[PDB]
Ligand binder design. Structure first.
Ligand SMILES: Nc1ncnc2c1ncn2[C@@H]1O[C@H](COP(=O)(O)OP(=O)(O)O)[C@@H](O)[C@H]1O
Ligand SMILES: Nc1ncnc2c1ncn2[C@@H]1O[C@H](COP(=O)(O)OP(=O)(O)O)[C@@H](O)[C@H]1O
Ligand SMILES: Nc1ncnc2c1ncn2[C@@H]1O[C@H](COP(=O)(O)OP(=O)(O)O)[C@@H](O)[C@H]1O
Lengths: 374, 60, 128, 374, 374
């Protein structure tokens, strides 16, 4: 069916994006949050809504307990995930899920039951004719337009590095780090108590996330930046709360993202993202290491702090041998790249035979995804 | 060993209502909720596609 | 090192020169042979190595030679669509039981001279 | 007949060479390897390539496992040999095999089934009008241009000595030694371990072979060179790995080829190449020995080490009586000499009588090759 | 005997064993791990410790980062080795090192700088009167009580096969494989992610090692065992973590040691241990292969999985010719077996002539060991 176009649903811990195949941009982007009321209702006849999904929960942060169904790339609560998928299909896109194939994404290293539950829910509740599950790291390489390179993807829930040479992927060199954007948000909310600002509930967690998105950067030299910040007040900015209160972020702007490079601030003994990328490169074979050095690819929202590319290049160049050439590739639209290449994956002619059919699922149970999908 | 992938039909192709509601159902399948423009190139042909093209096109 | 230098001189001069002359002559002759059949439709190639990358002209040439309808090329301008378009022609050649050895889509896309020339020669041996 | 030139194909264990008759140099020279992928293939739409053969098997050696169809001059796997021959005939030379006859080379002492299967393959599949099989060391004497002499041919698979006097070859004095550059590469890979460098995969063996071809030489005196290497560091040289790492080979440079003269480093009980040549000389009659002393011919790629000729001349002079004059003839083009001899043999007007016609094969089966040829 | 009994020290990658000569069992066995504090120091008044060595570092894994001085049989860090040797001599055995000769063990193929540095440390710092260095496989053959056999010793860092015929070893037939228990532990960590259990820090490495030691076995037939495990719930075991949580391992029990026989599970292209042993046998002479077939000796902790002997016998018998029988002699004492052999080597009267005297070390230097040992 040439008329039928598959839906690409980029599914992450922080945001959910959805669109049609062959399109350069997703149609609907919205936060993946679920809120329920926490205060007494005294006005009769106002309504009977008891669950808020998406921007409707984000607007009414005052009277809701916001919570995330997906934590560290794993769907902890499945009822809220069904809620999010229903709101995606019917209210955001206005399409019938029974007429289209659905393409879904997930982290590389997952519990194996997650794929089976996702496939069973997509086949039984929505009656999709076909579906497929892909890995978010490969789709960024599709979006970058190159067949070889190493993909470092860090989103709201999980960080992972995957190297691919000439279209061939090495599984033993895949590295997963649980450091992500929510840990940075929690670190910012912890270090903001030094100046006297206390943020404790979920709405203030959203406020802290907005502060981190708007006012943060990565220092090229940490100690020199700390000395400069202690010397004068040139590295200071002001932010206005919804209460109208004005806070001064000051020194903390380059301290929150630095926990990505030094995880010992958060109590974790794991290596930094630059060291993880270097280890993933060095785990590969000798002949292909130069091409992986030349084609490092950055992806995910968390990698849009200003100056992260220069710091990453400097650290890798310090780690790597001096005679090799190091390049860091950071597209300006990288936040959506995991979606974009996925749409490309749905636009290929040979991919039409890679869908998991409804008949195949009926024949083989939910465990068909392990032998059909990478 | 000797077969062509593209000549075969897609796997997902294998498997009363009001006529106007059927029309609105199958009008919504298009990405623009309407039939495409005939003499208009698709999104991949257009140069505002954000992803970079192949190297030979860059040399051209 | 002196005899080593002389051996490098020999295999830098003669082995390169004879092969380059032969492949230049073969390139010109194959270009004329392809242009003769491709002139039935309004298509013409100036360079054999460069115009055959995108895979469209290979599909046009195979359509002219074989006489039936190959699947239409993938609508794209990326490297992946280029690989797909070359792979379609290679699979269509796999129909006709023509034997191709060390031939892949990426070899044609990258522009290896010897393998492109061998592909054209194999097509000539089949369809003459 | 005049414009038609028979193809000349030199087929050793290491590399394959091919060209036209009457040419001074072969047109196509490429290694004889067949590689296959081993890792995951995850990018959809890149195309399927089952096997990699030849020079472009070397370029993508990072994601391939490499196999040699010919071991010790014997074709162990015949399907890969058909792959190599097809790639030679079509991709490398662009000639139809029906148009021209084919001239092949082989080792002196080989199993009969190798010759029978070579004849059967070159008649039944490639459909050649004529074919001949010759000895490499005989063609080396054609390339040298002298009627009499002893040829010591050392390639990648096997070393052999044949004496020829006045165009007559003595079969009982032909000597074969299974000691070539293949075992030297293995020995270098073994002795590089004690300096801290470890190469185990088949892809790293090509790197070790390149190191051997770039930084090896034969010492004229072994003990004095060992004392010099122990005393000073002037013998040390540096090599750069493909990933930018730098290694220092140092003492090993004159120890890897020294296994040619003393096989006891490899555990072999056999004699050295100089003793093998001397024994092959003394196995002949008394009268011709003087002439066999004056026309020793070196050939093959293994004899390209610097200083091999001086050491060989010194050892033969030490073994031989003092009243005789010992000289070693080593042309600079001794790697390709066999092929040149083949062309000289293929273009003779007399040799047009000696071709094996297809009708004779059809009458006599694959057993016709032993009655003709040698 | 009027001589001070020498100390026998087995220095492997995983554990260190130490005892006196002539004793049937080692006195001290403890892990070779050097831990360091990583958290913030509060509660002034309690004594501080610079580093934790050995068993004590296993008692306080929560507040330490845990590191190995030996990696792949090579001493990467030498200060930690000096600390471990000091703790062995003064805390565990509580003897004066200057009164006793010292016997040490190492891997067959390793850099010579390791031997030179161990000799330099044991003469210059600890000031021992004499020492000797031996290969672990030879000591295993000593402990087996037979003179002729082939030894496959696999510790926590390296695997090696050495054939010895009537007191004569074949250097060309010695094979080394870098596949040991630590790679199996890493593979177990990677495959435990499928069930949802995450172990990342160095403290959880010991927990995963305990899980591997307690609940793993080698299946006789891999495919039949996989079918049986997928068929029902007959094969699951429950393990209790030190935090109180209970995990179920199930399918993974026979999948972790299977990587010993199929290294392609780890991405390596090397052969299995059965193919390595068979190739080591085939590299020997024709006459001694029959004796080597019937005298196969297993040693090392990594060969302590249940069912390893029957599986190894089946795999070797498949490759071997049918006319002979294959014996797999696995002593119940194999984990300590190397040390036992060392004690026997320290009890012979003729071994007293082979000690490296202190005067000899002053005479020649640290380079004497290559002339003296092996
Ligand atoms: N412009 C920005 N600058 C800095 N950080 C950002 C920006 N936009 C988003 N982020 C961070 O990235 C996270 C969102 O990541 P996202 O790409 O949604 O992950 P996923 O799509 O995998 O769920 C947010 O938590 C936020 O902290
Ligand atoms: N320049 C060189 N110097 C030293 N040894 C060489 C050199 N070139 C090749 N060799 C050795 O010769 C081998 C190749 O020999 P080759 O001539 O291909 O044998 P054949 O053609 O009979 O198979 C290589 O494996 C290498 O060991
Ligand atoms: N009972 C057992 N069952 C399974 N594996 C074991 C057992 N005991 C030890 N091991 C494995 O063997 C390793 C210890 O080997 P060891 O003999 O100490 O090596 P070395 O002494 O050469 O360092 C441990 O890492 C462990 O994984």
């Amino acid at each position: 069916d040439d008329d039928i176009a598959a839906l690409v649903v980029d599914n992450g811990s922080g945001m959910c994006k959805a669109g049609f195949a062959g399109d350069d941009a997703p149609r609907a982007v919205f936060p993946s949050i679920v809120g329920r009321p926490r205060h007494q209702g005294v006005m009769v006849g106002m309504g009977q809504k008891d669950s808020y999904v998406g921007d409707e929960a984000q607007s009414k942060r005052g009277i809701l307990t916001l919570k995330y169904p997906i934590e560290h790339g794993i769907v902890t609560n499945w009822d809220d995930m069904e809620k999010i998928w229903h709101h995606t299909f019917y209210n955001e896109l206005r399409v019938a899920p029974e007429e289209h194939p659905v393409l879904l994404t997930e982290a590389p290293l997952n519990p194996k039951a997650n794929r089976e539950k996702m496939t069973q829910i997509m086949f039984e509740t929505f009656n999709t004719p076909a579906m497929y599950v892909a890995i978010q790291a490969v789709l960024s390489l599709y979006a970058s337009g190159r067949t070889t390179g190493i993909v470092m993807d860090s989103g709201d829930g999980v960080t992972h590095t995957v190297p691919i040479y000439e279209g061939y992927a090495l599984p033993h060199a895949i590295l997963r780090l649980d450091l992500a954007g929510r840990d940075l948000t929690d670190y910012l909310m912890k270090i903001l108590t030094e100046r006297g600002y206390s943020f404790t509930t979920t709405a203030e967690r959203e406020i802290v996330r907005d502060i981190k998105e708007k006012l943060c950067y990565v220092a090229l030299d940490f100690e020199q930046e700390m000395a400069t910040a202690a010397s004068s007040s040139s590295l200071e900015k002001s932010y206005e709360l919804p209460d109208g209160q004005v806070i001064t972020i000051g020194n903390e702007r380059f301290r929150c993202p630095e926990a990505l490079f030094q995880p010992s601030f958060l109590g974790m003994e794991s290596c930094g993202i630059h060291e993880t990328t270097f280890n993933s490169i060095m785990k590969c074979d000798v002949d292909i290491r130069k091409d992986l050095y030349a084609n490092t690819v950055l992806s995910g929202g968390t990698t849009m702090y200003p100056g992260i590319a220069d710091r990453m290049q400097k650290e890798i160049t310090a780690l790597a041998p001096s005679t090799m050439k190091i390049k860091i590739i950071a597209p300006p639209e990288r936040k959506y790249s995991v979606w974009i290449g996925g749409s490309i994956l749905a636009s290929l002619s040979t991919f039409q035979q890679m869908w998991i059919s409804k008949q195949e699922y009926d024949e083989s149970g939910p465990s068909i995804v392990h032998r059909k999908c990478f | 060993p000797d077969s062509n992938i593209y000549k075969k039909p897609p796997i997902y192709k294998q498997r009363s209502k009001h006529l106007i509601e059927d029309l609105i159902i199958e009008s919504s399948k298009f990405p623009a909720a309407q039939p495409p423009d005939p003499n208009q190139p698709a999104k991949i042909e257009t140069d505002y596609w954000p992803c970079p093209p192949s190297l030979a096109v860059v040399e051209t | 090192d002196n005899d080593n230098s002389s051996a490098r001189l020999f295999e830098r001069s003669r082995i390169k020169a004879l092969a380059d002359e032969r492949e230049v002559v073969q390139k010109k002759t194959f270009t004329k042979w392809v242009n003769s059949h491709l002139a039935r439709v309004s298509c013409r190639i100036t360079d054999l190595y460069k115009d055959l990358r995108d895979g469209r002209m290979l599909i046009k040439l195979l359509e002219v030679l074989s006489g039936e309808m190959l699947p239409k090329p993938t609508k794209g301008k990326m490297r992946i669509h280029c690989l797909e378009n070359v792979d379609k022609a290679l699979q269509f050649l796999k129909e006709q039981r023509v034997h191709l050895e060390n031939m892949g889509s990426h070899d044609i896309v990258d522009g290896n001279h010897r393998l492109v020339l061998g592909l054209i020669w194999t097509i000539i041996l089949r369809f003459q």
